[PDB]
Every structure is written in structure tokens, then in C-alpha cells.
Nucleic acid binder design. Structure first.
Lengths: 79, 95, 313, 75, 106, 96, 303, 97, 82, 105, 95
DNA sequence: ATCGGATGTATATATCTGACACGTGCCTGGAGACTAGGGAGTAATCCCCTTGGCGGTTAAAACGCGGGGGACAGCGCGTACGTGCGTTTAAGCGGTGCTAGAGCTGTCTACGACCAATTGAGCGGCCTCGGCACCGGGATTCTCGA
DNA sequence: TCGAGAATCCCGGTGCCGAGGCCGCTCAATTGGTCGTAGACAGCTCTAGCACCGCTTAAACGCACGTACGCGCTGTCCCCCGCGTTTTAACCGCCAAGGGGATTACTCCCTAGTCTCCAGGCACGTGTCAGATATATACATCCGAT
């Protein structure tokens, strides 16, 4: 299955503007999408295992916060 | 209109004021289910979790860009290139 | 006005400094150096008055006379001399069988000085004829009894080292008033010190059960011979259990201070409402010796290890 | 009839206590008069224990006497 | 009988005591730990809400939106040192533009 | 199905905000962020106190250990203010 | 009634005893004249201590610190010097002024000094060395009086112009400029113990004191003469509630803080009383006058 | 011997230290350093002879790592040396500003 | 007592050797001072946490376990000392 | 009374000791007879592995005594142990040799 | 004098099992004692928190298995879980 | 490009001496034996929304053309670092006494767990009303090419 | 130094769904004994981080000089941004179900806790040897000769 390219180019243009930079080379988008893949995969592994040890085949919503907290980040505003 | 560099600061100031998320949900979710399928598939999720994910990721990305910008300024240029992202991720301690 | 909020530096006219006390409204500071000398610094002007060569063995307590013409000191070598404030020489000399803890003068009778001998009844000395009178006491005669005047000095209150406190006359010596302290729950406790004030007849009592108490200088005589103890405020620390060594009273008649020894946790409260109001951020490393406020203006000035930490407005 | 209550600072206040009036009523009158909370005050007669839930008729304190109003901490 | 009014706090003391007891942090908890911890939580939350309300006053909004919280936390330095590895949802970023990267002309 | 009950620090921080500023309100997402903030700080301090008690071979959580935890955890003058407030609160509570 | 009776009549100088100041510690009197002499006399006995010299021409104003260790004298030889009270020798130099020195005083904190000359500015010097630190523009006319506050944070600047000014010591800029429409010349000012009221010894037969809280004209102190000469003023709270000042009718007068009543008129001086000093710890007053008196009167009292 | 060209013996020195295992900082100077720097926190403290060692060990390790990161930044600026700006950049990007 | 000395005790060849093990050839001559600074600011936090741990335990000596406890609290662990 | 539990499975490292040290560890309420045992199992397994790599580097370097340097090199060079022990230090060890390409002449 | 806890003989034995020729000094068993005790504290705290996470009254094997799956990466997890299951079978078979 | 010499690198030889391992005494935890009681899980159930799917449509991006500001290569210059060495200066042992200090144990007095039961603060379901979302239009500020 | 066009902010104008209030129904928060205990005070027992000085020498300071390289300048050219357009899946509006997320009953079984003898491991001696110390030699490399 292949759906990686959905995150468009002006979107990361807007994020770069958020960051505070004005000049961007045209060969920067591929590795930004690679970084996004890596971050997403690491977060979703822990999320899915956190749900798997419920003795329930299901998934919850606090588990994303759990995974983010254990990864090193932490999110305020969701339970 | 024309004159790149000025409208760049226009949008930079708008976006430093704005507070909106900018990523899509369905490729997000198909990646979620496929990278679970790599480990275990058909897991029964929630609905407001997605938003959460997006929020974190966006913060991540924007923060990262800041560091890369500094690296570019360290090389006496303005344009940021794929080299600076790798430098910033290596010296950060996440390789 | 209110409690002090600013902090100032150190006032070291000379390197060594042990004791400190104000006269009536913070005029001069009497320091007993640990070399046998008595130095007089000028407070509110940042100066000095006179240095007196008392004797060889140093002093450890010091005070001024009612008329301000004498400098008496509880010497460690039992040298009871009435050093002149003006000339700095020795006016009258006498020797006592025991060392003294607190020296005081009756603000209405300069002739009868206050003495707190060790393991003996307090001695009251007349400087008109160098005659010593032993204050009548009760029970044991070998307890470390500390004697102190009232607001006006008309009555003298003495505290034994077992839990008995007597009140008697500063000149008549008619023992009529006695008091037995509360014994807690199971065990009795000795009493360390008593500190008085200038308005309200309040007095604080520092005891040996690690709790400070406050009473009034009008309850011992009214109850009769002896009655029931009734503390007004049982103030203590419950996070560190800090022992209490030195503690003074306020200059306006409404506040109360308890001091630390090495933790520099200076606690203050007020008599009307017994709540904590401020805590002093003091640099650890020294043992506090003397604390005294201006009898008019709220201030704190703690002398310790030759230096002085002053907090004022 | 009239008696005295002594504070810590030294001031004495002349107050009125009815012979058939409980202590709680006197405490309420004092609180409404000067504002000092009854939980910050108590009755002491010549160094003897007195409580709030009783009557002066039961204790029978003699006339024209003083009561040492020992200050407390609120509550 | 009430216990938080005994000390003048507003966060509950019985609730904190229960939450500390059942969380298995130790086998035998004390009696002053709940009140101490409730007081610390009081001071910290009031400290945050002060600048939160001031920043709300900047935007005149009766309700305090999250961006006010983000501005209050990020603008201060001690609270920066406290919530450093922390992200606040929907709070945006604090304005900043690089000094060298300032296009200007006559 | 059968209803359950959950506790949040809602009314209490509402009271604190009203006491500090009696003219401003709060939103539900600000409510959630403040609740999560309180829970995070509570968990951090309690965990540090538990590990300190275990390290020092003590089986009890006294009030000294919590003050050591807030000295180790909170930075700068914030620690001084917090320890002063805690000491004031415990001193006011004990004699009542 | 303040029963200040003369006890010691002091006259040791040559030109004119026009500057005697009772130091706040109240130890000795540093009498000054326009003959480059600084004579130290006693306070309760009038004992002769010494005569410190070393300047070149007369002195306009003399002041001691709170501890009465530093000594500033307004010598007009383009130099000022500090004389040790114990010995009487030069400690440090105060070079930097361009003309005659008209005013100079001290700081109760014993850490700052202010001096003034005809260079339309006021200067400060380091107490340890005596180098040039700051030159704050005071007025457009020579400064007649300047002194610190008891809190050691403010300065009051008075000149022959009239608009009083309060200058911040922390920044060197004036806080309040009280402007008077009639613009009557001022001669002397003195800080209040609380640092809220100032007493502008105005040259209009009126000691118009000012409040810098809001900038409002207050009541009028009359019953004396003050038109030309630099008449000073001082406080007295030992016996009662009084303010002493000289007058140009060749007498010393005393009034109340806010009552406007004459309670004592010290006579004996044959010329205009140019300065007044009140003993801090005793009811002793010493007043200095112009050339025609050359005498110091110690008025002692107990209540 | 003679005045030799730079960069030849620096490589050998790097080879020697990168292989060896010892303590590059003298013992007693670190002793006095920790004694002085523990004065502020509490006076009259007495150390364990095994504690301080541990401490210094950790310190040097941290320092070594920092330098490596700094070196990387220098290579990113197209030069060889180490200028004070590189250490500041490494500290800021690392997360310990 | 506080004196300006004893900061300079860790000499310049020591920084040289630490850099060499770090893997560098050329180093400018003005990096030593800020290396002093960073070493001092690193030492301050660890020693403060160690003395806090030893102060809560009612002794005036720090063991080799308080230092490793403080380091582990910071984020850097030690292996070899207990 | 004989036959210590550590030998009940042919194992070597203490298991009564680790059982006790989870007993009095105040970590939870009921302490089982299997979990600190599996802790002792990973103890034997990873200790054997780790002194294995120590001796491996030792025989690669023909020292008759093992220093922690061999252990540090084994952990540093490997990949999964390097990822697990990301923030860690080893007493009296060192750095594996590495030289930048640009630095070489 | 008194009694203290330390592993001294067992580490020497496990060094002798495969490599029966080489000895060690104090620093060596110190660092292995540090590793064992530190993985001990870390591991029992991890297990106990993973326990209180899911409302139980003991320590089990399955919580440990999921924690092992959640911290450790691939091959080390495989090796550890394999030897642990071998240990569980060999202990349960003969008690 | 090629070859030789001074100089630092790498390895074998006496030996010795402080540190490694082996041997031993007997005292405090650990498993042999056994019970009851309290958590849990296992079969069963019932209703909410996620799991899965469809009708409108749109502002945002997928894809093609225009041009000028910044990235990149080269070259010179003088400057600060490296390599060497002579020497002073404070580390390195080493040895010594020890006073003021850290540390192991008998014990009993103050403090927290538990439980019976009370009963008001607090949470949950239903209005509810406006703070705020959505929308129309005019007033307001900025930038570069003539 | 100056305007057309283009962007931005605010004043109503209107309606709407979320934070607040209120009623009602809990459930856990106290109060007071009870009881068991652990941790606090004094005692003696060990002892070592430190003042004190003596003899020695690695090595850090400081000076000399030679030059690789960091920095500034110039020029060329190429590609990033902006403009525009046509096209477009991702998101608006809805519906259904099913199954399992949460909830209950319960019986069974895992171990806290108690008694216990032994055993096996920590402190204390005593024998032994592996790499440091300094010496002598073969060899690889910077640097200078052609």
C-alpha cells in the first residue's frame, strides 16, 4: 500500500513559514516526508501495543497520550 | 504580488499569529492500519485520537525547522537544504 | 509600620563581635569581643563610641545601666566590674561565686542590678555599698534559675530548672507568687529561658520540650499561691523540629520572634493572630548569638560569628 | 450584673452577664460587640478551667471579679 | 468534617490524601503530606492563572483561550524551565523572526 | 451501561481564578489543559517523593520528603515561594 | 514654652562666622568662616578642639556625615577637601568644579557626596578616591542648597530661580519640578524625615514649604524677613514640635509645622542670621550670622 | 628537532588518546575544584574519596562528547578549527541553552 | 572563602587532550575560557543535587551513591560505582 | 532442607536473593515465585552474553585480564545494545576509534 | 565487620563458564554489580508501575512480557523472551 | 616523482612486588510444612458509536511558464596556531599523628492503620441564556515602480 | 521623494450551541478508640580527611618562528519564487449495526503470614604471579636532498 505523498508541498511550506525561515531549496520535501514517516511509525507502534495489552482487541484515545508521554514528548489538552 | 521576500514575511507573520492544523486524516489512518498490520491488524480505534496525533506532529515539525534555520545561518547563507536537517537531527541525539 | 521587607549588609566596625543589645530606642550597640574587650558601636550613624580593655578573660554578656552611666557584663572570669560609659575605666569591682547569664538594670532602680548565678539563688547587688542579697527561692538551691524584671521592673520573675517559676518583689523580697508548669502527657520538662517586653506585660517562655509558649505578667499573682497553667499560644515547628536557643520580642508589642541556631529559619508571628507571616532567607553556616528589634521601629538584626545580618525597611 | 474581662495587652473591659444567661450568649454578645471571635477567646478565673458549654450560675463566680481572657488561634 | 478550610486552601485535602494513598507510592503515608502538596499545587496553579488572565486581558476575552496559556508559559523563564519538554494543544507559537533574516531597503 | 464517576480539578481552579480575577471566564479546552497540568505536577512530585523515601530506607512519606522533592524539582525562586507556602499551610493546619 | 537660654558665646574666627552646623550625631561643632579656617568647638561645654586649615579662600557651606567622619567644605578655590575629624588632615580631593563652590552636603548612608558651583550643575565624587563621576544639570542659576534625603534616594535642588526640583539619585533625572507662577528666588531646602515635605527658604519674606505628592501651594509662613541672603532652616522635635530659621531682621525665629505661630524669638545677633542649627539629642541651638555678628550662641534648654 | 609542518603529529596524538584508557585531568586540581564549588551550598562538608572520583569521571565523559558534536559543526562550516561560536551552536541545538 | 583563583586549575593541556580524544586537529586559542565556564555550570547542578540528597539524610558527607543518584535524576546514568 | 532454588532449574545466579530483593523492595503487594526468578534468568543470560563479548574482545587482544574497555567496545560497536543504552556511561572505559574523512590529509 | 550485600563469586563463575582463562580486578565486578543492581531498580520499578497501571494485586509474567515488548527492540527482545520462556518451562516442569 | 636520514613507534629481555585468588569460621536469612481468606476471571449480557458506506462540492493544490538574487568556485594576504626547547613551579609520592569526626546498637514513647457509622460536598441529567461563531460591508496601512 | 492596487481591521447584525446553574441522589470523609510498632536518644566503637612538613621531578610557562588557512573580495549562472490555470479527493451533509466496552456473579485458588533448622555465604589470613620499570633493537614516516 502506498499513500505517503498525501502531505502536500505548500503544507510544509506553511510549516516552514511557521518556523521562521524564508528561503527553501526545492530538494527538501522528500526527507521531510521521510521524517514524518519515521515519527508516525514510532508513535503508532507504542499506541497499538498500549491498546493490545488491554486484554481487549480494541483501541482507546488516551493511548496516544500515553505513547507520546513515554516517547519523550507530552501533550496537554486531551483527558 | 511580485518581489519574493516581502510577501514571505507577510505570510510568516500571519502564520506566527495563526493557530491552525494542516495535515490530512485518511492517509494518516491507512498508514496507521498498515503499520499496525506490520505488527497486528484490525484494531478497534477511537475517533478523536487522530486530531491529537496531528497536533503533536505539527509541533514536532515546526520545532525541527527552527534548529535547521540556525544551522543555515551558521554556514553564512539563508536557504535551508537537506544537509542542515540531517545535521540538526544528528547533533540533537536522535539518529 | 509592618514587618521588614528589605535586607542590608554587615556592620563590622571590628572583626570580632559576640553580643548585641539596644539601649532604649536603638542608640548604641554594645559588643563583647572574645578577647577581653568591650566595644561600643554607633547604630543609625555607622560609627563607634569607645573601646574598653576590661580584663584578660573575655566576656559573654553585656548591658547598660538605668542612668546609662555604667557598663556591666557577665564576665567568664567572675569579674563583676561597673565599667564607666564616659571614662571607660573601672568604677566599682566585686567578685561573685558563680558566673552570670543575663545582666539587667531596673529602669526605676539603678542600685539593684540583676544577676543569674549558676546552681544558686539569684543575687541582687547594691552599688551604693557593694552589698549582695540572695533572692529567696523554693525547692532546690542548685538549679540554673534565670531571673528577669517585668515591664517596669517592679517585680522580679525567677525560673528554676525543674518546672517551678516564682514571682517576688524587686526590693521587698516577699515571696508570695509561685507556679508549676504543665507536665504534658507523661513526663515533666525543664524550662530554658524567659524573655520579656516593654508593653503589655507579655513574656515568652522557651522550654525543653521543643515548644515555645507565651504568657502575661499578671497571672501568677492573681491565681494565688499556685494554680493551673494556661498557655496562650503553643508555637512550634513541625517540618524540622528546630531546637530553640535565642529568642526576643517585638518593639511594638504585637509581634513575636523565634530563632534558629544553624538552619537560619527565623520565624515570626503576631500575638493577636498566631499564624506564620514571614520566614527569613538567611545564609546558612553560622550560629546565631543575639537578636533585638528597635523598641520603636520594626527591624531585625541578628549577630552571629562576628558578623551581623540586618533586615529592615 | 457587671464584671471585667482582661485581654493580653492589658486592657480591661466591663461587660454585663445575666444570672440566668448561658456562657454561649455572653460569647455571642462579645463577638457582636467588639468583633473578637469566640474561637479566639476563652474564660479563665484565677487560673482555673472554664468552658463555653456551661453557665456562670453553675460556676458561681463572685461579683466584681475579673476573668483572664486567654487569646487563642482562630478555630 | 471539612479539612481544607482548616488550612485555608481551596484544592481538596481529603481527595489528595485518598489519591496519594491508593496510588501505591509508599506503604504508610503521613498526615502533613496532603496539605503540603495541596498548598504547592495551589501556589503553582494561581501563579499560572495570574499571567493567563493578564494575557486574556490583552485579548479582552472573558474566557481564557489556550494561546494565552502558551504565551504566559513561554514568555516567562522559570515556567519555561519547568515545562520545557512540553507541548500545548491549539496554543500556537511565540512570535520570533531572525535578526540577520530581516529584509530592508531605503 | 452502568454509570461511573470521574473526578477533575474543575470547580477548584474555577474558584482560584475567580478569587484572583473576578471578571474572567474559562473554556472547556482551557479546563482540560489545567486539569492535565495539575495531574502532571501531582504525579511528578509524588513519584519523586516515593523514590526518595525508598532510597533513604524509610517506609513513610513524611512532609520533609515532599519539601525535598519540591526543592529538587522546582527551579529557582519558585521553589522558595512553594516551600514558604507549604510551611505556612501546614503550620496553620496543625494548630486548629 | 521652649525656654532656650544662652549659655556659651563663641567667637574665634576672623572674617565672619556664617556657617555652624550641628551634626546629626551631635558630637562637635564645625564652625566655619570666610578665612579658610574650620574650627572645631565643643557642644555641651564649648571646648576648643583644633583649627583645621589648608584651603585658600573662605568657605560657603560645611557639612558632616551621619557618623561625622567625612567633612565637606565649600571652599571657592576650585577645590574641596575632606578633613579627618580625629586629626585634621586632607583625605581626598574634589577637583572638577569650574568656579566658586556655592553648596555642598553629604549622604546619611555615608556613601555619596554632592557639591555645587557656578557651572549650573551638581557633581558627585567617589568617597574612597574623589574622582569625577557625574555632572547633573541642576538649574540655570547657581545652586544655593542641596542635600540628600534620610532614605538616601532623593535630592532636593534649590536656586535663585524658584522652581523647586526633586532629582533621583538612581538615575540623575528630576522626578518633580514644582513650578511657582511668581517665581520667587529660593535660598535653602531641607529633607523631611519621611521624605515627603520640603522647606524652600524662599527669598520673599516667606518660608514656603512644598509638598511633592501632588504639587499644590500650601500655607504661608510669615513673621520674619527673607529677601536677599541665603537663610537656612532646621527642625526641632526634642522639646516640642518646632522649626527654627533665621530672618533678615537680624534675629532668629521659630515656628510650628502647620500652625503658623511665633513661639520663640532668639535675639542677640546684630546682623542677619544666615544659618541655623539645632542639636539632635539636646535642645541646643546655634545660629550663624553675617559679618556684623561673628559670634556663635549656644541656646540650651531641657523642654 | 627542527620546525616541522603542522598536522602530522596531531593525528598520532589523536590515535594515542582515542585508544588509551586513563584520566586526562589531574586528580588534585579536581579535588580543589569540587571543594571550592561545594562551599556555596553548605560549609564544612567532607567528601568520600570514592565519590569525587565518580563525579570527575562523569564530567570528563560529558565534555568529550560535547567536543565531538562541536567538531561536527565545524565541518559543517567548511573549516577545520574550533571557534567559540561552534560550542554555543552545539549547546543551543542540543537542548541545554 | 571565595577567591577568583582555582578556576584555572584544570590546565590548557588537559583541554587539549580531551579535545584530542574528542577527535579534533585544529582548535583556536580562545575556546579554553568558555570550556572552563561550561565545566563549571555542569558541575554546579550535579553538586547541588548531591548535597541536597546528603542533607535530607542527616549527614555532612556525600557518598558515591548520592552522586550517581543525582546524575540519574539529571538524565545521565553511571555504571561502575554501585 | 537442601537443594537451593537456583539449582532447581540447573541455573547458577542466585534466585533466593532476587526473590527476597523483590520481597522487601516495597514495589507492590504480593511478590510471586516467578517474576524475580525470570529476572535472575535474564541476569544469567545477559551476564553470560556480556562477559562473553568481554572475553571475545580479550581473546582478540590476548590480555590475561579483562578490563571494562572490552565491555564498552562490545556495547558501543553493536547496534541494538547501542540503541538500548543510549544514555549510559562505563567507568574506566573509553571511546571507539573514529576519524573524520575530511580531517585525513 | 557487619554484613553487606554484593555479588562477588557468581560473576567470577559466569566468567569462568565460557572463558576459563582470564581474571579481573575490583573495577570489573564493581561495574557488573552496578549493572545488576541498576537494571534491578529500573526493572522492578518498571514492572511495578506497569502493574499498578492495570489494577492488580501481584507481579505476574505477562505484564513483564508486554513491557519487554514495549521497551526492547527486536533481536534483544527475541533472545530475552526466548530464554525467559525456557526458564518458565524448566521451572514449572519440576518445582 | 624518488631516495635517504633523524626520530618516534613497536617488541623482547631480567624480576619483583604489590595485588589476585584460595582456604576457613560459624551466624542470620530461606526454604520445608501448612492454613484460610480475599482477588479474580470466567460465562453472560446489553446498548453506543466506530466501523463502514454514500450524495454535494470546493477551496486548495497538481502542473506549466518568467526572471533576478543568492549560492558556489577561485584567489590573495597576513594572521594566529603548531612544533621545539629552556626553565621555573607546583603536582607526586611518602610518611606521620589524630582530633574531631562518622558509625553500630538497647530501647520506649509518640504516630499511623482500621474500623462503625455517620451525612453533606460533589457529580450527573435537564434547562438555559448569552459569548461567541458566521457574515455583510467600509475604514485603514503597506509596498514598489513610475 | 510620490500614487494604484492590494492587503488588513473593525462596526455592526443575527443567530446558535456550549459553560453555568439547579435538583436530586449518592459515597466517601470524618471521630474516636484501639493497637501495634518503628524510629528516636544516648551510649560506646571505629578512624581518616587533614594539617604538617620533606624530597623529587613531570610538566606547564614563556619565547621563537614558520606557514597553512580563515577571511574578504570578485565574478558567473541557475533555480526559487510567484503567477496563473484546470482539475480535483477530502471534507461537508447523513445512516446503520454489531459487537464488544463496560458491567455483573461467582467460585477457586495464590499466597500473607507463622514455625524452623540449616547452610552457605561474608570477614580474615596467607600463598603466589603478571604486568610495570628500565634497557636494546628493528622499523615506519616527516621532511628534506635530487
Amino acid at each position: 500500500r502506498d499513500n505517503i505523498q498525501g502531505i502536500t508541498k505548500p503544507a510544509i511550506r506553511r510549516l516552514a513559514r511557521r518556523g521562521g525561515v524564508k528561503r527553501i531549496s526545492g530538494l527538501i520535501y522528500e526527507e521531510t516526508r521521510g521524517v514524518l514517516k519515521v515519527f508516525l511509525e514510532n508513535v503508532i507502534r507504542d499506541a497499538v501495543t498500549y491498546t493490545e495489552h488491554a486484554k481487549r482487541k480494541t483501541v482507546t484515545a488516551m493511548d496516544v497520550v500515553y505513547a507520546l508521554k513515554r516517547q519523550g514528548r507530552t501533550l496537554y489538552g486531551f483527558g | 504580488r511580485y518581489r519574493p521576500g516581502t510577501v514571505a514575511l507577510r505570510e510568516i507573520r500571519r502564520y506566527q499569529k495563526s493557530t491552525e492544523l494542516l495535515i490530512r486524516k485518511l492517509p494518516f489512518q491507512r498508514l496507521v492500519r498498515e503499520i499496525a498490520q506490520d505488527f497486528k491488524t484490525d484494531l478497534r480505534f477511537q475517533s478523536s485520537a487522530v486530531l491529537a496525533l496531528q497536533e503533536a506532529s505539527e509541533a514536532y515539525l515546526v520545532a525541527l525547522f527552527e534548529d535547521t534555520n540556525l544551522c543555515a545561518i551558521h554556514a553564512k547563507r539563508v536557504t535551508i537544504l537537506p544537509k542542515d536537517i540531517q545535521l540538526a537531527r544528528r547533533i540533537r541525539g536522535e539518529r | 509600620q509592618n514587618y521588614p521587607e528589605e535586607a542590608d549588609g554587615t556592620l563590622d566596625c571590628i572583626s570580632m563581635a559576640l553580643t548585641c543589645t539596644f539601649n532604649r530606642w536603638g542608640t548604641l550597640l554594645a559588643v563583647g569581643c572574645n578577647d577581653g574587650r568591650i566595644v561600643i558601636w554607633d547604630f543609625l550613624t555607622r560609627g563607634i563610641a569607645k573601646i574598653i580593655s576590661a580584663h584578660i578573660h573575655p566576656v559573654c554578656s553585656l548591658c547598660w545601666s538605668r542612668d546609662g552611666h555604667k557598663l556591666v557584663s557577665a564576665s567568664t572570669d567572675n569579674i563583676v566590674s561597673q565599667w564607666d560609659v564616659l571614662s571607660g575605666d573601672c568604677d566599682q569591682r566585686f567578685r561573685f561565686p558563680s558566673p552570670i547569664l543575663k545582666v539587667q538594670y531596673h529602669p526605676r532602680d539603678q542600685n539593684k542590678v540583676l544577676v543569674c548565678p549558676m546552681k544558686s539563688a539569684p543575687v541582687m547587688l547594691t552599688l551604693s555599698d557593694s552589698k549582695h542579697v540572695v533572692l529567696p527561692v523554693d525547692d532546690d538551691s542548685d538549679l540554673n534559675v534565670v531571673a528577669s524584671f517585668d515591664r517596669r521592673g517592679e517585680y522580679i520573675y525567677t525560673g528554676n530548672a525543674k518546672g517551678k517559676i516564682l514571682v517576688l518583689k524587686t526590693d521587698s523580697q516577699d515571696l508570695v507568687a509561685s507556679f508549676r508548669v504543665t507536665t504534658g502527657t507523661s513526663n515533666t520538662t525543664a524550662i530554658k529561658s524567659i524573655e520579656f517586653a516593654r508593653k503589655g506585660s507579655c513574656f515568652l517562655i522557651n522550654t525543653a520540650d521543643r515548644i515555645i509558649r507565651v504568657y502575661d505578667g499578671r497571672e501568677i499573682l492573681t491565681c494565688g499561691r499556685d494554680g493551673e497553667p494556661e498557655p496562650m499560644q503553643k508555637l512550634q515547628d513541625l517540618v524540622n523540629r528546630t531546637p530553640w536557643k535565642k529568642c526576643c520580642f517585638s518593639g511594638d508589642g504585637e509581634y513575636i520572634v523565634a530563632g534558629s541556631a544553624r538552619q537560619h529559619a527565623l520565624y515570626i508571628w503576631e500575638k493577636s493572630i498566631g499564624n506564620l507571616v514571614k520566614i527569613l532567607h538567611g545564609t546558612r553556616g553560622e550560629l546565631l548569638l543575639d537578636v533585638a528589634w528597635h523598641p520603636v521601629r520594626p527591624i531585625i538584626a541578628s549577630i552571629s560569628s562576628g558578623v551581623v545580618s540586618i533586615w529592615a525597611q | 450584673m457587671q464584671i471585667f474581662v482582661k485581654t493580653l495587652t492589658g486592657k480591661t473591659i466591663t461587660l454585663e452577664v445575666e444570672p440566668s444567661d448561658t456562657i454561649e450568649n455572653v460569647k455571642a454578645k462579645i463577638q457582636d460587640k467588639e468583633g473578637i471571635p469566640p474561637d479566639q477567646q476563652r474564660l479563665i478565673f484565677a487560673g482555673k478551667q472554664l468552658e463555653d458549654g456551661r453557665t456562670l450560675s453553675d460556676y458561681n463566680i463572685q461579683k466584681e471579679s475579673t476573668l483572664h481572657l486567654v487569646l487563642r488561634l482562630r478555630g | 468534617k471539612t479539612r481544607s478550610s482548616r488550612a485555608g486552601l481551596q484544592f481538596p485535602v481529603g481527595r489528595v490524601h485518598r489519591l496519594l494513598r491508593k496510588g501505591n507510592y509508599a506503604e504508610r503515608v503521613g498526615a502533613g503530606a496532603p496539605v503540603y502538596l495541596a498548598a504547592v499545587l495551589e501556589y503553582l496553579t494561581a501563579e499560572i492563572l495570574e499571567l493567563a488572565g493578564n494575557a486574556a486581558r490583552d485579548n479582552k476575552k472573558t474566557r481564557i483561550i489556550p494561546r494565552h496559556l502558551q504565551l504566559a508559559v513561554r514568555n516567562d523563564e522559570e515556567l519555561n524551565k519547568l515545562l520545557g519538554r512540553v507541548t500545548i494543544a491549539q496554543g500556537g507559537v511565540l512570535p520570533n523572526i531572525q535578526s540577520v533574516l530581516l529584509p530592508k531597503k531605503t | 451501561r452502568r454509570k461511573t464517576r470521574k473526578e477533575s480539578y474543575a470547580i477548584y481552579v474555577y474558584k482560584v481564578l475567580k478569587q484572583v480575577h473576578p471578571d474572567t471566564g474559562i473554556s472547556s479546552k482551557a479546563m482540560s489543559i489545567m486539569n492535565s497540568f495539575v495531574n502532571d505536577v501531582f504525579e511528578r512530585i509524588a513519584g519523586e517523593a516515593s523514590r526518595l523515601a525508598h532510597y533513604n530506607k524509610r517506609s513513610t512519606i513524611t512532609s520533609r520528603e515532599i519539601q525535598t522533592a519540591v526543592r529538587l524539582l522546582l527551579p529557582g525562586e519558585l521553589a522558595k515561594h512553594a516551600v514558604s507556602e507549604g510551611t505556612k499551610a501546614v503550620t496553620c493546619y496543625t494548630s486548629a | 514654652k521652649p525656654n532656650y537660654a544662652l549659655k556659651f558665646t563663641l567667637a574665634g574666627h576672623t572674617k565672619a562666622v556664617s556657617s555652624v552646623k550641628f551634626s546629626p550625631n551631635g558630637e562637635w561643632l564645625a564652625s566655619s568662616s570666610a578665612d579658610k579656617l574650620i574650627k572645631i568647638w565643643g557642644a555641651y561645654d564649648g571646648k576648643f578642639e583644633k583649627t583645621i586649615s589648608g584651603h585658600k579662600l573662605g568657605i560657603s557651606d560645611v557639612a558632616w556625615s551621619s557618623d561625622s567622619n567625612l567633612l565637606v567644605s565649600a571652599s571657592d578655590d576650585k577645590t574641596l577637601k575632606i578633613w579627618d575629624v580625629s586629626s585634621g588632615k586632607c583625605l581626598k580631593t574634589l577637583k572638577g568644579h569650574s568656579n566658586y563652590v556655592f553648596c555642598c552636603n553629604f549622604n546619611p548612608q555615608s556613601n555619596l557626596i554632592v557639591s555645587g558651583s557656578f557651572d549650573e550643575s551638581v557633581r558627585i565624587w567617589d568617597v574612597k578616591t574623589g574622582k569625577c563621576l557625574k555632572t547633573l544639570p541642576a538649574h540655570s542659576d547657581p545652586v544655593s542648597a542641596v542635600h540628600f534625603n534620610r532614605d538616601g534616594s532623593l535630592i532636593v535642588s534649590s536656586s535663585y530661580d524658584g522652581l523647586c526640583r526633586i532629582w533621583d539619585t538612581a538615575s540623575g533625572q528630576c522626578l518633580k519640578t514644582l513650578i511657582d507662577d511668581d517665581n520667587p528666588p529660593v535660598s535653602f531646602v531641607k529633607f523631611s524625615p519621611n521624605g515627603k515635605y520640603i522647606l524652600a527658604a524662599t527669598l520673599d519674606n516667606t518660608l514656603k514649604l512644598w509638598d511633592y505628592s501632588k504639587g499644590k501651594c500650601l500655607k504661608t509662613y510669615t513673621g520674619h524677613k527673607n529677601e536677599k541672603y541665603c537663610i537656612f532652616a532646621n527642625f526641632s522635635v526634642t522639646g516640642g514640635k518646632w522649626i527654627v530659621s533665621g530672618s533678615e531682621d537680624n534675629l532668629v525665629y521659630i515656628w510650628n509645622l502647620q500652625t503658623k505661630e511665633i513661639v520663640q524669638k532668639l535675639q542677640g545677633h546684630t546682623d542677619v542670621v544666615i544659618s541655623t542649627a539645632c542639636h539632635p539629642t539636646e535642645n541646643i541651638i546655634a545660629s550663624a550670622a553675617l559679618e556684623n555678628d561673628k559670634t556663635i550662641k549656644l541656646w540650651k534648654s531641657d523642654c
